[PDB]
Each structure stands twice: as structure tokens, then as C-alpha cells.
């Protein structure tokens, strides 16, 4: 499945994560800035919120 990928310093590009989960990492409390997206599902941190999906394309939006 295709997903978004980026760091706190790059624009969102779309990449093939194949068959792995995707993730959306953002600041858990306001302001809820998105800190990053990519392949995998890294554990949340209560300070950083991490939501993961498995499909469909662009699901970590």
C-alpha cells in the first residue's frame, strides 16, 4: 500500500510501504502539529500521538 512519508522538515511524498502498516505521528496535545509520516507503526509516546493503518492507499493522511 502507498503511504505518505516525511519528517518534521520535508514535504509529504508518497511511497510504497508494500505490506506493512503506515503511521501518522503528531503532537498529542494542542497544537496538534503532525511531526511525521512513514512506513511501520512506532509506539506512541503520550506526548506524541501515533495512529497506524493498514489500508487503503494514503491512509496515514
Amino acid at each position: 500500500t502507498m503511504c505518505y512519508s516525511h519528517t518534521t522538515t520535508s514535504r509529504a511524498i508518497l511511497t510504497n510501504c508494500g505490506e506493512n502498516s503506515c503511521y501518522r505521528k503528531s503532537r498529542r496535545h494542542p497544537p496538534k502539529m503532525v511531526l511525521g509520516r512513514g512506513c511501520g507503526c512506532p509506539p506512541g509516546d503520550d506526548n506524541l500521538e501515533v495512529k497506524c493503518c493498514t489500508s487503503p492507499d494514503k491512509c496515514n493522511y
Binding site: 505518505y4 522538515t9 514535504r11 503532537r27 494542542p30 502539529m33 511531526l35
Partner: protein, 535 residues
């Protein structure tokens, strides 16, 4: 070295610009001119230094790197958020400025407009499409300069009182460009005696910091502040809070206790990315419209807090143009307030509205928040989801932009300045933000710059007509100090804002309309009452 029109000798050396195609003709663009030594390594957090001279002919035909910054990726693929992302590579080596002049070069000193970009002092770049001065140059014979200045920690991490991290260096980067424009704008045909600064959001706030800081005050003559001010809840922080944030960020990145010198020394071994990964975690309250590293009241650049400075300075010599858009707070809500998304109508519950007020007015006491709910609730229909949604928007916009501006307008006018005020009420037809957001923060910029003047861009005829008018007011204000007309008695006049009449105008497709009082009762609440309830 063929078109002698694109060849220019500034004090630093020879430059070669590029001819560009506006919609009606050509313009001389001189892009990527280094105005300072790259503030990297040991220069990080330090005040900028003039660019040492160079031999040979430097290529100024392209936009330079963008200052290291956070990229807003809330909505991947959404033009609303992405039109603000940097459009060139990120680097600490980013102190370059751009100059647009008509083609050919002008035969008489033309008035100069220097643009300072916004972006909450944490993001921004003078190379974004919306700041393209090819239009102002080609259509109004404008000579326009725009510079890059450090944002985020690099531009504002401070440890007040230390020599290695004095703070406000991003504002100094701005000033250096101003100094540059002085010593060199002549070679391009710009009148160095008619400089007009103008910016939006944090840019507008910067402009205001220039008016307030004497050293910068002698490098320009007029100023325009769109949707932002130096006074206000977000443009500045106290030295105590700055130090608080700097020393906390330092802790987060492993630097290490710590005395200034060695704390900053450690911070300079840190990878740029690493600082930006922690930038958003030093804010004191859960909130929106709050940025980690902004200008600090150091008693140096800012002799006292903006509030003090605006109630006591002499602005007799000042000519200002200030204004706001219709829905100043629309999109900020979408950054953390429970219930707001660009994807739906964002209707909310009274309960959400209550939770929202704390986030939108983060420094407000339980009592203050309470007073805000009182003021913004329509007690006939206290739960209508729609009204609540709109009220939330209004809370945030009034607290952060509208009232701080009105306060500024008021204080300046009341002290000899000749102020002109406006409200931008036209929602662009191409707007990708949800219709409920109305006319969002920053969406007048395109019209002022003249982008709808580009056939290549989808717009309406009205809009292109509209654009020109704006381009006109600004440039007339730019060269005379008055937005009106050196001849044709324009039947519809824009009167200066005064404490007596408080007139201001509405910029929209319809002809000018004169109104009185900038959200007068509401800004009295914000500017006269709440501050008594928080002391």
C-alpha cells in the same frame, strides 16, 4: 554578460540578474543575492554579519535556500496548507534577498517596497509563489525587495543577557537586509529615501518591531501591517519565558544543568533537524496560534514591551496602513481545537465550545476564559452549533489579530501617526479551504501581489480588476503615504483612521465603503478589560 540591463554592481561585487516574463511585459529579477555571511556553525543563534565582498560576477538568477524550518504537513496534498511549505531546499545558509525592478531599469529613483514574510516566526520563505513581485514591478513600476530571515530556534532561541544567544537575531537578519537596501538599492534604480516595509502575520509583526526599534526606524519611511502586530498575545515573549523555552529545548536535545556559554555551545553541535524535532514541545499551555520561538523583550532591540512602546513613543513622522481579513481565526482552529477539521462543517457543542475557549485563549485564567464565554455567547440561542463554531473562530481571530491591530491603530493614531485601516472581505474563488472558514488568515496576499493578473491562473475578471485596485492603493500608499490619487478626484475616498471617528474601509469587489469602529465594543473587552482581570 550581454544584457547590460541585468548587470549590476552592488558594493559587494558584480551581479547578474535574469529577465522574467510578467503577463504584460518583462522584469529584471536579481535573485539569491547574499546579504550576510552564512549564519552556521559558531554563528548559529548569533547576530548576522555583512557578506564579505566577492570577485567575479555572481549569478543572481535563481531563488536561494530556505531557512531551516518546520514544514507544515497537516494535510498532505492539500493546497491550502502546502502553498506555504518551503519551495526550495532548507539550509542554515539562507540569508539571501531578492530584487525585482521593471524592464528596462528605471530612469528615476523609484519607491521601494520591502516585503517581510509571515509564518508565525517558525516558517516562511521570500521565494513562495504568493510573494512574486514580478507583477508589482511590471504593472506599477515598483522596485520590490524581499529577504529571507531565520525562523524558529535559529531565528529566535534566546538566553537573554548572554553574548552567544542574545535573541531576536532573526529580526536583525531583517534589519541587515534593510541596511543592504540602503547602501545598494540605488544601483537598481530604487529610491533609497522612499522605503516602505510591509508584511503579513509575523511579517506584519516584524514590521511593527522595526517601527518600535529605533535602529531600524531610520532605514525606512512608511510601513504596512497586514493581519499582525508587535503588541499582541503571540508576537513576543518575556526574557523569562524565552530563557525558559531555550533551556527546556536544550534539555530535550541532550544539552545536557548548564550555564549560558556552554549550553549554547552544546546547542551548536546539534543537527538542525534535531532542534526542529523539539521546537513544538516547549509551549507552556495547550494551545493554537502559539509559536515556540518568537521575538523576545530584551530591553535592547525592544527597549520595553511593545505595549509600553506603543503608548509612549512619538509617531508624528509615521504613516501606516493596517488591516485584517474577514475571518482571521478560521484555519487555526483546525490545529487542535476539539471538533474542527477542514473536511466537515465543523459544527460543535456548547461543551466543545467551552473546551475550545481554553485552547484558543491559552494564557487566560479560569475567570478570564469565563468572561470570554460570556461575551461570545448569544444568550438567545446559546447552543446553536453553527453560532458556536463561528464564535470560536471569532474568539481566536479577535484575540490574536483584530483587537491587537485595533489597539495598534488606536494608539498610533492617538500619537500623531497618519493611520489608514481596512478589512479584507473578499473570499478568493480558487480557495480550497472549506467555505465555512470564510476569508482566512493570509488570503489577501495573493491579490495585493497581483497574482490574479496572471492569465495562467484561474480567477474571475472581477478578481483581476480587484487585484489592480489593491496593487494601486498599496503602491500609492507606498510612494505618497496616501492610498488615493495624484489627480482624478476618486469619487470614493479612503479616510485616515482616527481615535475620534475610527473610520476604516472594506476592500472587496464592490466599491469602497467607509465604516466606523473596528469591532469597537469587542476590542474594548479585549484591550481595556481583560488585562485588568489578569493582574
Amino acid at each position: 554578460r550581454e544584457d547590460p540591463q541585468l548587470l549590476v554592481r552592488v558594493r559587494g561585487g558584480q551581479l547578474r540578474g535574469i529577465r522574467l516574463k510578467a503577463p504584460g511585459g518583462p522584469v529584471s529579477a536579481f535573485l539569491g543575492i547574499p546579504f550576510a555571511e552564512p549564519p552556521v556553525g559558531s554563528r548559529r543563534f548569533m547576530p548576522p554579519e555583512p557578506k564579505r565582498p566577492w570577485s567575479g560576477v555572481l549569478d543572481a538568477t535563481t531563488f536561494q535556500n530556505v531557512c531551516y524550518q518546520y514544514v507544515d504537513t497537516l494535510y498532505p496534498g492539500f493546497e491550502g496548507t502546502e502553498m506555504w511549505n518551503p519551495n526550495r531546499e532548507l539550509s542554515e545558509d539562507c540569508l539571501y534577498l531578492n530584487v525585482w525592478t521593471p524592464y528596462p531599469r528605471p530612469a528615476s529613483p523609484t519607491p521601494v517596497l520591502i516585503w517581510i514574510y509571515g509564518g508565525g516566526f517558525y516558517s516562511g520563505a521570500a521565494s513562495l509563489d504568493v510573494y512574486d513581485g514580478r507583477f508589482l514591478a511590471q504593472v506599477e513600476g515598483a522596485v520590490l525587495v524581499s529577504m529571507n530571515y531565520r525562523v524558529g530556534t535559529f531565528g529566535f532561541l534566546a538566553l537573554p543577557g548572554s553574548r552567544e544567544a542574545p535573541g531576536n537575531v532573526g529580526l536583525l537578519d531583517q534589519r541587515l537586509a534593510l541596511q543592504w537596501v540602503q547602501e545598494n538599492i540605488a544601483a537598481f534604480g530604487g529610491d533609497p529615501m522612499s522605503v516602505t516595509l510591509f508584511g503579513e502575520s509575523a511579517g506584519a509583526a516584524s514590521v511593527g518591531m522595526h517601527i518600535l526599534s529605533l535602529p531600524s526606524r531610520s532605514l525606512f519611511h512608511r510601513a504596512v501591517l497586514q493581519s499582525g502586530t508587535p503588541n499582541g498575545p503571540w508576537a513576543t515573549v518575556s526574557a523569562g519565558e524565552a530563557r525558559r523555552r531555550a533551556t527546556l529545548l536544550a534539555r530535550l536535545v541532550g544539552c545536557p544543568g548548564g550555564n549560558d556559554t556552554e549550553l549554547i555551545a552544546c546547542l551548536r553541535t546539534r543537527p538542525a533537524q534535531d532542534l526542529v524535532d523539539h521546537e513544538w514541545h516547549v509551549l507552556p499551555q495547550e494551545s493554537i496560534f502559539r509559536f515556540s520561538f518568537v521575538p523576545v523583550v530584551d530591553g535592547d532591540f525592544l527597549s520595553d514591551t511593545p505595549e509600553a512602546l506603543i503608548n509612549t513613543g512619538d509617531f508624528q513622522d509615521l504613516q501606516v496602513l493596517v488591516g485584517v481579513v474577514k475571518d482571521e481565526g478560521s484555519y487555526f482552529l483546525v490545529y487542535g481545537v476539539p471538533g474542527f477539521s477542514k473536511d466537515n462543517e465543523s459544527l460543535i457543542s456548547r461543551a466543545q465550545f467551552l473546551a475550545g475557549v481554553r485552547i484558543g485563549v491559552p494564557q487566560a485564567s479560569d475567570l478570564a476564559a469565563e468572561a470570554v464565554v460570556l461575551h461570545y455567547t448569544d444568550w438567545l440561542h446559546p447552543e446553536d452549533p453553527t453560532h458556536l463554531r463561528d464564535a470560536m473562530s471569532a474568539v481566536v481571530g479577535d484575540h490574536n489579530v483584530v483587537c491587537p491591530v485595533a489597539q495598534l491603530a488606536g494608539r498610533l493614531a492617538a500619537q500623531g501617526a497618519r493611520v489608514y485601516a481596512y478589512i479584507f472581505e473578499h473570499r478568493a474563488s480558487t480557495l480550497t479551504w472549506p467555505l465555512w472558514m470564510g476569508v482566512p488568515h493570509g488570503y489577501e496576499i495573493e491579490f495585493i501581489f497581483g497574482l490574479p493578473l496572471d492569465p495562467s491562473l484561474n480567477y474571475t475578471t472581477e478578481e483581476r480588476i480587484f487585484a489592480q485596485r489593491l496593487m494601486k492603493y498599496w503602491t500609492n500608499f507606498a510612494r505618497t503615504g496616501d492610498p488615493n490619487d495624484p489627480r482624478d478626484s476618486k469619487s470614493p475616498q479612503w479616510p485616515p483612521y482616527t481615535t475620534a471617528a475610527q473610520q476604516y474601509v472594506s476592500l472587496n469587489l464592490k466599491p469602497l465603503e467607509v465604516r466606523r469602529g473596528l469591532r469597537a465594543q469587542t476590542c474594548a473587552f479585549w484591550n481595556r478589560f481583560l488585562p485588568k482581570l489578569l493582574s
